[PDB]
Design a binder for this molecule. Structure first.
Ligand SMILES: O=C(O)Cc1cccc([N+](=O)[O-])c1
Ligand SMILES: [Zn+2]
Length: 257
């Protein structure tokens, strides 16, 4: 099945998922000089004070931190969005080396990792319905650069030993995702897709301009995870990013001058 190896990686996905060659695929390169400032874009509203984290899972492709999305407890509104989007999970993409790992690029620059906070539009009632709609999902993307440690990440790093292999989960309550945000909420936005199969074209992307800093030791711990299940040959979970796709007939908008 699909993955990030030589024989099953991004360049092969189109055979099972023909939408891989579609008109609104993600990620993309953000060309800062051709993005257009749009004064009509509103500030983002991130309301995460009542978030309820539940569990952390190694799904064989990344690790997900899952939230209770049965009520409006952790929501995203404003920005380019109409309506209310509820947080369901976050996950990361990262590299084998500090000079790669992000999915989006900025003037062709790759960051060490990229955080995706995934939200679904409450008008569609459940996540599975929302992914079938062009405005179903809103994903907040945050870049990670290597430098100073991020204290609010450490609780995630320390539990990774307990979910080393595919299919393992652990209880993960009382985690506050506000400790992952940068100071500024200035952003770029464009219409795109999921970056893993099934690659559905259901996402409004909101990519923050300001990266967060994490330490070398924090990222090194991500690279100790395994793509494989327990008692199968070890293959390190690294380079779980899709490369940039053609922009086609899309414009990237900026919230800032
Ligand atoms: O890989 C999956 O399971 C599909 C999936 C599910 C949720 C969010 C996703 N995204 O691209 O942000 C992708
Ligand atoms: Zn992702």
């Amino acid at each position: 099945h699909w993955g990030y190896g030589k024989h099953n990686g991004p360049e092969h996905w189109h055979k099972d998922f023909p939408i891989a060659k579609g008109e609104r695929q993600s990620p993309v390169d953000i060309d800062t000089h051709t993005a257009k400032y749009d004064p009509s874009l509103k500030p983002l509203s991130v309301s995460y004070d009542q978030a309820t984290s539940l569990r952390i899972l190694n799904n064989g492709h990344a690790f997900n931190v899952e939230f209770d999305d049965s009520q409006d407890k952790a929501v995203l509104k404003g920005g380019p969005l109409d309506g209310t989007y509820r947080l369901i999970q976050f996950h990361f993409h990262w590299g084998s080396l500090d000079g790669q790992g992000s999915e989006h690029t900025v003037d062709k620059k790759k960051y060490a990792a990229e955080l995706h906070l995934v939200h679904w539009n409450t008008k569609y009632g459940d996540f599975g319905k929302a992914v079938q709609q062009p405005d179903g999902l809103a994903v907040l993307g945050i870049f990670l650069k290597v430098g100073s440690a991020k204290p609010g990440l450490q609780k995630v790093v320390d539990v990774l030993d307990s979910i080393k292999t595919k299919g393992k989960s652990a209880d993960f309550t009382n985690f506050d995702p506000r400790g992952l945000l940068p100071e500024s909420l200035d952003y770029w936005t464009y219409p795109g897709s999921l970056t893993t199969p099934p690659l559905l074209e259901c996402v409004t992307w909101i990519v923050l301009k300001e990266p967060i800093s994490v330490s070398s030791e924090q990222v090194l711990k991500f690279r100790k995870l395994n793509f494989n299940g327990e008692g199968e040959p070890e293959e390190l979970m690294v380079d779980n990013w899709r490369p940039a796709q053609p922009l086609k007939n899309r414009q990237i908008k900026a919230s800032f001058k």
